[PDB]
């Protein structure tokens, strides 16, 4: 009767030199928050892995723990191992992650087209990682299209959230939430992120941009602060008011007016992602022309 299935192992950090277990190529996959990401190979099995190198420090020890916990969710890059070694005198955390060769979320989309129930299905996988994190009290804080990478190039590869460099811990049957724990509004901007991704998923471009030719709120910063965006044509022509209202409620300037991740998940559009109009979008096209 016991929720054994909720019991997961903690993270044992290895001290042995990572070079005993992997070949660490000098090739960079990219620069994550607070560390580079090289490609490494498993000396015993020859499989390919990603490696983030962090310099050991309090923020560093926060990222590993947070990311370790989040890893239990299938939509977040798996951690294979964490090493605490000595790089050139300095102490650092070496995070071994599973390989994601599927490419960015939008690269896949760009290479093709994309319907709206498709976009819904995608928006729901992302929401799944986000939902898991907020339920264990973690705000990712750097959710952006570019941190969502596909596992393989297969048609059924799964999308996974990466980079926990800005992640943050957020902390009677009739007690109100505000009394069981303060908790500011750091979750809240993960939701804003969801907003921007969804928008781009339906038309190929972002809602906020640079436009000095404007009269009011030239600056993109200003347009965001104000909350100045819209659903022009034809991109949004056949997109449902239902969808647009959902973006309206994720992209609200006032953190607290913003929709929570449970509301998001229970929304009909994400929930009934198999009754949603398979209406065509200009995403793929728009994306290619940039």
Q: Is residue 264 part of a domain?
A: yes
d(CA 123, CA 252): 18
Of 99, 121, 153, the position where a domain reaches its end is 99
d(CA 35, CA 107): 24
Active site (annotated) includes residue 20: no
Write the DSSP assignment of 159-214 as a string of letters.
EEE---TT-EE---TT--GGGS----SSSHHHHHHHHHHHHHHHHSS-S----TT-
The residue segments making up the domain with residue 124 are 100-277
94 & 114 share domain: no
249 is in an annotated binding site: no
Resolution for this experimental structure (Å): 2.7
213 is in an annotated binding site: no
33 is in an annotated binding site: yes
211 & 74 share domain: no
121 & 227 share domain: yes
Q: Which of 142, 163, 186, 190 is catalytic?
A: 142
Q: How was this structure determined?
A: X-ray
176 & 248 share domain: yes
30 is in an annotated binding site: yes
94 & 229 share domain: no
CB 260 within 8 A of CB 135: no
Of 67, 99, 131, the position where a domain reaches its end is 99
100 is in an annotated binding site: yes
35 is in an annotated binding site: yes
131 & 177 share domain: yes
Q: Is residue 69 part of a domain?
A: yes
d(CA 177, CA 262): 14
User: What is the torsion angle, in degrees rounded to the nearest 10, for the CA atoms of residue 54, residue 60, residue 64 and residue 70?
Assistant: -110
Of 99, 115, 148, the position where a domain reaches its end is 99
Round the CA-based radius of gyration of the chain to a whole number and report it.
21
* CATH value at residue 62: 3.30.200.20
């Amino acid at each position: 009767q016991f929720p054994q299935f909720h019991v997961k192992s903690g993270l044992q950090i290895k001290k042995n030199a990572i070079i005993d277990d992997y070949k660490v190529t000098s090739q960079v996959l990219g620069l994550g928050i607070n560390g580079k990401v090289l490609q490494i190979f498993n000396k015993r099995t020859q499989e390919k892995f990603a490696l983030k190198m962090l310099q050991d420090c309090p923020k560093a020890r926060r990222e590993v723990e947070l990311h370790w916990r989040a890893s239990q969710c299938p939509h977040i890059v798996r951690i294979v191992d964490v090493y605490e070694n000595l790089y050139a005198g300095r102490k650092c955390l070496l995070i071994v992650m599973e390989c994601l060769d599927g490419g960015e979320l939008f690269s896949r989309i760009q290479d093709r087209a994309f319907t709206e129930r498709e976009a819904s299905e995608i928006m729901k996988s992302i929401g799944e990682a986000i939902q898991y994190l907020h339920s264990i009290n973690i705000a990712h804080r750097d959710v952006k299209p570019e941190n969502l990478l596909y596992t393989s190039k297969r048609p059924n590869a799964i999308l996974k959230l990466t980079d926990f460099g800005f992640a943050k811990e957020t902390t009677p049957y009739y007690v109100a939430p505000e009394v069981l724990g303060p908790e500011k509004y750091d979750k809240s901007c993960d939701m804003w992120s969801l907003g921007v991704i969804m928008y781009i998923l339906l038309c190929g471009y972002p809602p906020f941009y640079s436009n000095h030719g404007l009269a009011i709120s030239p600056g993109m910063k200003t347009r965001i602060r104000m909350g100045q965006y819209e659903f022009p044509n034809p991109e949004w022509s056949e997109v449902s008011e239902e969808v647009k209202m959902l973006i309206r409620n994720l992209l609200k300037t006032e953190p607290t007016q913003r929709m929570t991740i449970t509301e998001f998940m229970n929304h009909p559009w994400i929930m009934q992602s198999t009754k949603v109009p398979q209406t065509p979008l200009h995403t793929s096209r728009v994306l290619k022309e940039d």
